[PDB]
Design a protein around this ligand. Sequence first.
Ligand SMILES: O=C(O)c1cccnc1
Ligand SMILES: O=C(O)c1cccnc1
Lengths: 346, 346
Amino acid sequence: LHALLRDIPAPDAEAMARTQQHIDGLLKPPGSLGRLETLAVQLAGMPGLNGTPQVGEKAVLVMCADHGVWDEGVAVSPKIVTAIQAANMTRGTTGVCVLAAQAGAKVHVIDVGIDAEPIPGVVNMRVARGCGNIAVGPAMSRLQAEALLLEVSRYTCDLAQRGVTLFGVGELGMANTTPAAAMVSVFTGSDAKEVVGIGANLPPSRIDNKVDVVRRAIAINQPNPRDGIDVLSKVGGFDLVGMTGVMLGAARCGLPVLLDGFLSYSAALAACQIAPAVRPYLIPSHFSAEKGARIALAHLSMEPYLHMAMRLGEGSGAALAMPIVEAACAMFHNMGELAASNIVLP
Amino acid sequence: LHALLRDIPAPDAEAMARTQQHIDGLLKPPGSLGRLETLAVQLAGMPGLNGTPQVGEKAVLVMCADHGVWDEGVAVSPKIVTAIQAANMTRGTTGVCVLAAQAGAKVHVIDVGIDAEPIPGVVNMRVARGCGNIAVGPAMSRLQAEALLLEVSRYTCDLAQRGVTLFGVGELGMANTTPAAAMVSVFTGSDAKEVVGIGANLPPSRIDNKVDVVRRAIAINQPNPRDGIDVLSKVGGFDLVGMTGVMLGAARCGLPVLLDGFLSYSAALAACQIAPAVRPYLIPSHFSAEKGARIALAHLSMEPYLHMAMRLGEGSGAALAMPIVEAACAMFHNMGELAASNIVLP
Ligand SMILES: O=C(O)c1cccnc1
Ligand SMILES: O=C(O)c1cccnc1
């Protein structure tokens, strides 16, 4: 693990300078394609990409797990929905499934801690049958967190060996917006009231209780904001841990990862805390409708491309942004050049 | 023309109610897919769509024309770029071409007033060799404007007869951000300083002159803000007119149109002024980097989906948003149902 973190490659400034120059020569006013240009250059700096903006195979990794905090009445969805939906993920009927198919991406469902019998067809990396209730103690042990990070990290880099060049991260876990909010509060230094949202249609009344639960989790566990693993293990969850693991894995592999929504932002804060070298590999997708999204994004210094008021999760926003990534590549490789048309701009 | 405007269909409230209900039953918390849901319902109300969110063939119509106002020093691109780029549109090397191909859309290049010899391969609907210089008089005659509207309108609806279900609008015309700004100022009641941008890399110094040119255009022509055709003919251009015509055509045909950037917003204001019935058929794509974009969008009451800081034009933003439209359709048709999984949410 220390190794892993040690070996995360820096971005290739040389490939990036070459990309920039190429882009500037394209058939358009310089910088006119804005964020599409910046993205392309960003991709070019990624070592696993072979010095150019490219997209080969695509995969969305969905981390599923249950949370003990569900018992605190912080979620209106029945707990069993985690297991049901995970199964549905196998049949291609879920939101992420439909969107991924549209993007030509494959979905990998990973069980990191569902509180139910094993689901056939789902990748088994189960830590336990749901994590501890963060309101009265830690979600899991440091060991458990570190092990899972390692395991998902490897699984991720391994997919690279098989042609995957672009990853997307997602989750599934009833009540997971609670630990997500706690992490955000901790890493950001924001008060819980500011970052706690309605999650999956939590009624406005019930909010207060959610905020109190978050506060309790923090007071009780005293996670250290300077230690991302500390935070994850104390006030996070298996699903959140697995997401951070995908990010660590892609980075080590020198490949890009598309974030999803709120849950993903929380995992991204932790990953960046654990290894700042991770940052350049992350790509935002959309702007989550969750209340604490703006704050989380600000701390990551990211501006998402899509404003869809989405708040489903599962990696649906990541899938939806994949075509954008491919567009930056198409632009880069298929557009004609100014010089060739004899166009000279001041 | 009065006919045409007369026959624009209202949206189908019945299909819309049916869509909403179907969406609510999908495998996700209600309203969790946000804007993707709203879009789907919007499409379902479009009569040319057959009561459901569907996307058959896609087309981007690019209206090319030159402007006499170029002589006022309001643009740094050589005038000839309009003709060059129009030709390039035929070879598939431009920005819109590359993006449309990625979206599986076909690009139709239409010459409505390029100041050069006819370009083989380009649809010929040329009004004149560039429009009049709005700084000292009107861009064209009311007759000319009305005729072009009619002609493009028909061309548009005709494509429908051949399987096109989704249109995208674009333009190409050196100096066109000047008339675009004038229209925006007029329709919005905003002062020119607020809506005049740098267009295609106009140097900061040169701005002042651009603002003065806009003001002059307005003082001199006295366009009537309550008459969209009046405004288009006086302080618009052929390209702008053609774009409005596509919008009128799609609406009459009861089909959706994806807007592009700043130039497109200006055309949309005019179309809406001419026929409010047009509004429900319009779909924003991205948030143009042009200074006056926020104001124009506010008046159209639209919030774009994409924030890419783009400012190329040609219909590139429209092409980039097409996958989003298809996503709303995929969601609608391919997702599983709550009831089927025995999921009950309060
Ligand atoms: O932003 C998300 O991904 C999200 C928000 C609420 C509930 N589930 C997921
Ligand atoms: O927003 C646009 O479409 C645009 C802005 C500047 C120059 N050309 C096009």
